[PDB]
Symmetry: C2
Subunit: 69 residues, 2 copies
């Protein structure tokens, strides 16, 4: 996956939601430093942490699979 796909994904939909990164962190119940790191392109974020951020922004994850058709 592109290195800044999720970075811009979180930033765009957070700015479009009017949330600061402190408000998005408080809503997701995660650390403030996590929002900074994600939007900077860092991918060492734990997934249960990332999903708590995505749900506040109403973004869900689909896995496209090689089979079946």
């Amino acid at each position: 996956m592109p290195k800044h796909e999720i970075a811009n994904l979180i930033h765009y939909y957070r700015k479009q939601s009017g949330l600061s990164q402190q408000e998005l962190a408080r809503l997701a119940g995660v650390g403030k430093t996590v929002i900074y790191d994600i939007e900077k392109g860092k991918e060492s974020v734990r997934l249960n942490t990332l999903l708590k951020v995505l749900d506040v922004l109403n973004i869900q994850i689909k896995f496209e699979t090689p089979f079946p058709q």
Copy 2:
């Protein structure tokens, strides 16, 4: 809201269907074998970059459902 064991069965099913052992999938993804064991047991503390290396070996890509635009 993604359920707590979606990733565990996703990695397990497609690793079993690919004929790869836990250690075989770990060496391809460049991660520890215990990491593969922990993912399939359900723990979601797996790191994002760690997950992406496992998914890319299994030819699984992440797509995002966004609320806008239509």
